[PDB]
From Swiss-Prot:
InterPro entries: Thionin (IPR001010), Thionin-like_sf (IPR036391). It comes from the Eukaryota. This is Crambin. It is found in: Secreted. One of its GO terms (biological process) is defense response. It comes from Crambe hispanica subsp. abyssinica (Abyssinian kale). Keywords: Disulfide bond, Plant defense, Secreted. The gene is THI2.
Length: 46
């Protein structure tokens, strides 16, 4: 599951993904994170 710290971080994440970039690269690029579970924390609410 991906969790993002802000709205624009998510928007940027989704653009990064469009060419097929790995989630892990897009995470470090944007500040989003990948977790194994499905429950994002309150500080990665977007």
């Amino acid at each position: 599951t991906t969790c993002c710290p802000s709205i624009v971080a998510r928007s940027n994440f989704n653009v990064c993904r469009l060419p097929g970039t790995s989630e892990a690269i897009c995470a470090t690029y944007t500040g989003c994170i990948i977790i194994p579970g499905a429950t994002c924390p309150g500080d990665y609410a977007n």
